[PDB]
Structures are given as C-alpha cells and as structure tokens.
Amino acid sequence: RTVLCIDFMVFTVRLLHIFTVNKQLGPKIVIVSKMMKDVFFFLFFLGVWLVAYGVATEGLLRPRDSDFPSILRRVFYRPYLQIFGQIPQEDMDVALMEHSNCSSEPGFWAHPPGAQAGTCVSQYANWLVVLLLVIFLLVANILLVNLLIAMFSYTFGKVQGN
Amino acid sequence: RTVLCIDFMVFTVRLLHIFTVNKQLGPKIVIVSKMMKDVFFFLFFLGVWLVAYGVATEGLLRPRDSDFPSILRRVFYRPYLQIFGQIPQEDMDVALMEHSNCSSEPGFWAHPPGAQAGTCVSQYANWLVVLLLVIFLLVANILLVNLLIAMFSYTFGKVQGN
Numbered sequence: 001r002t003v004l005c006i007d008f009m010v011f012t013v014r015l016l017h018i019f020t021v022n023k024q025l026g027p028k029i030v031i032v033s034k035m036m037k038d039v040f041f042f043l044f045f046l047g048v049w050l051v052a053y054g055v056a057t058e059g060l061l062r063p064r065d066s067d068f069p070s071i072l073r074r075v076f077y078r079p080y081l082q083i084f085g086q087i088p089q090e091d092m093d094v095a096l097m098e099h100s101n102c103s104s105e106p107g108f109w110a111h112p113p114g115a116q117a118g119t120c121v122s123q124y125a126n127w128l129v130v131l132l133l134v135i136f137l138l139v140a141n142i143l144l145v146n147l148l149i150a151m152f153s154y155t156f157g158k159v160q161g162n
Numbered sequence: 163r164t165v166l167c168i169d170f171m172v173f174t175v176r177l178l179h180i181f182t183v184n185k186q187l188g189p190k191i192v193i194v195s196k197m198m199k200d201v202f203f204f205l206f207f208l209g210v211w212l213v214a215y216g217v218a219t220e221g222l223l224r225p226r227d228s229d230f231p232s233i234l235r236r237v238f239y240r241p242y243l244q245i246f247g248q249i250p251q252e253d254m255d256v257a258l259m260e261h262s263n264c265s266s267e268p269g270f271w272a273h274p275p276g277a278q279a280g281t282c283v284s285q286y287a288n289w290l291v292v293l294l295l296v297i298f299l300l301v302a303n304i305l306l307v308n309l310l311i312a313m314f315s316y317t318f319g320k321v322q323g324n
Binding site for chain 1: 199202203206207210211213214215217218221222244247249251257258286287290292296299303304305308309311312313315316
C-alpha cells in the first residue's frame with residue numbers, strides 16, 4: 001500500500017510531461033526546470049540556519065524527554081513549520097507555562113503543554129530563547145523568502161526567451 | 163435567496179467596469195485582465211500537485227469514515243487551506259493523537275480529534291505522511307507562489323505600455 005501511494009504521485013506528476021505539447025502550458029513548464037538552482041540555494045541556506053537555530057534552542061530549553069526522534073523533531077520539524085505560521089509559543093516560552101518542580105536537578109523548571117515538546121524544560125535563559133525565535137523569524141520568513149523571490153524574478157527574466 | 167446572494171457579487175464586480183473611465187484606476191484595471199494566463203498556469207500546477215499529495219496522504223492515513231464528501235474534503239479542501247497557514251497537525255500526525263483500538267483490522271490505529279478527519283487512522287507509515295506534508299509546504303507555499311510572483315512581475319512590465 002505504502003509503495004503504491006507514492007507510486008500514484010509519480011503518475012500524477014507525469015501529466016505535466018503530457019502537457020508540454022500544449023502551446024500555453026509548455027513554455028512555462030520548460031521555465032519551471034530552470035529554477036532548481038535557486039531552489040537548491042534556498043534549501044542550503046535554510047538547512048544551515050535550521051541546524052544552527054534548532055540546536056541552539058534545544059540546548060537552551062533542555063527538555064527531559066531526550067529521545068532521538070523527539071530531538072530530531074524539535075530540532076528540524078518544529079522550526080520548519082514556523083516558516084508557515086505554526087509558532088507554538090506555549091512550548092518554548094516559560095512565561096506561558098506552569099512553573100513546577102518536574103525534575104530533581106537544581107534550577108527552575110516549567111511544564112509545556114505540548115505532547116512532543118518535552119515534559120519539562122529549563123527556565124534559565126528563556127529570554128534568549130525568545131530572542132532566538134525573533135531572529136529566526138526575521139532571517140527565515142522575511143530575508144530568505146524575499147531573496148528567493150528576487151532570484152526567481154531574475155532567472156525568469158533571463159531564461160524566458162531561450 | 164441563494165441565487166440573489168451570488169447575484170449581489172455579480173453587481174459589485176461591475177463597479178470596476180464603472181471606474182475604467184477614471185484616469186488612475188483604469189490603466190491598472192486593464193492590466194489586471196492580462197494576468198489570467200499566469201493565474202491559469204498556477205491553477206493547473208496547483209491542481210496537479212493537490213491531486214497527487216491529497217490522494218497519497220488519504221491512502222497513507224486510511225481514515226475509517228470513507229464517505230465520498232469526506233474523501234473529497236480531505237483530498238482537496240484540507241491541503242488547499244495549508245497554503246494559507248491552516249495546518250491541522252493533530253489530524254495527520256499520530257504522535258499527537260491518542261493510540262487506541264478503534265478498528266478490528268490488524269495493525270495500530272489512532273484517533274484524531276478532528277470532526278471531519280476520520281474517526282480512526284493508521285499508524286503504519288506516519289513518518290511518510292509528515293515528510294509528504296513537509297514536501298507539500300515546500301512545493302506549494304514557497305515554489306509556486308514565488309514563481310507566480312515572478313511571472314506577474316514579468317507580465318506587468320511587458321504589458322504596461324500597451
């Protein structure tokens with residue numbers, strides 16, 4: 001079943017190959033393949049920034065459910081969804097959490113209500129976590145996206161006639 | 163009543179036709195009609211991608227409320243709203259659901275809290291569902307939208323003087 005599901009996609013994306021003959025869609029379908037270098041540059045920059053920000057935030061929060069899939073999720077998947085308006089403030093800001101003694105280690109700890117956000121996080125430098133969120137939003141949602149728009153415009157104008 | 167409601171819209175969009183005489187709005191109203199080819203290319207690409215992604219995700223999740231309107235909703239309408247920041251993670255990620263035996267078929271199943279998300283979904287390859295969501299967001303929210311922006315800029319610059 002799983003294989004066939006993916007197989008369906010591979011069939012559907014062949015419709016484009018069918019419509020290259022069309023006099024209106026085809027000249028645009030052939031330009032779409034010229035944007036892959038810009039897409040790859042965007043992916044490289046976004047991956048570097050995601051690694052840096054996610055590892056820094058995971059180190060600052062110190063969740064007590066440090067399973068490997070959970071670490072990968074909170075390092076890559078959760079910051080990735082913030083580019084699309086999914087910002088779980090209650091899972092990163094201790095001012096929005098309930099302060100309680102959830103661990104025997106010294107310090108102050110809070111309980112985030114998220115299911116995969118760790119059962120207990122540290123309150124030490126949470127202002128730095130908030131500042132990192134602000135900088136991440138600025139760099140990713142504003143700078144990288146508009147830069148990719150500019151690169152797409154330049155490439156489209158360059159490769160139209162060819 | 164229903165007809166008249168739609169009728170109201172058909173009247174209101176005639177205000178533009180009234181203001182073509184104006185020396186400021188008119189030259190832009192006549193350029194707006196030149197972007198329909200770009201809009202149609204965007205719609206074609208988005209429709210192909212929506213069909214592929216929605217059918218793949220519906221096949222992977224295997225909801226137990228497989229009514230035809232529900233299938234159409236979860237295949238077209240729900241992925242469409244994710245382009246505008248409406249991402250129901252709790253209805254697609256089994257890590258955010260409650261694991262329970264909601265079906266007699268062999269395997270593991272989870273209960274999504276959504277009202278039209280199916281009463282029971284499969285846990286088999288949910289990582290593939292999450293990866294498909296990531297790829298869908300990348301392709302639709304980032305690539306198609308910025309490509310349409312580039313095409314609009316090119317067309318506007320080309321048809322301004324004419």
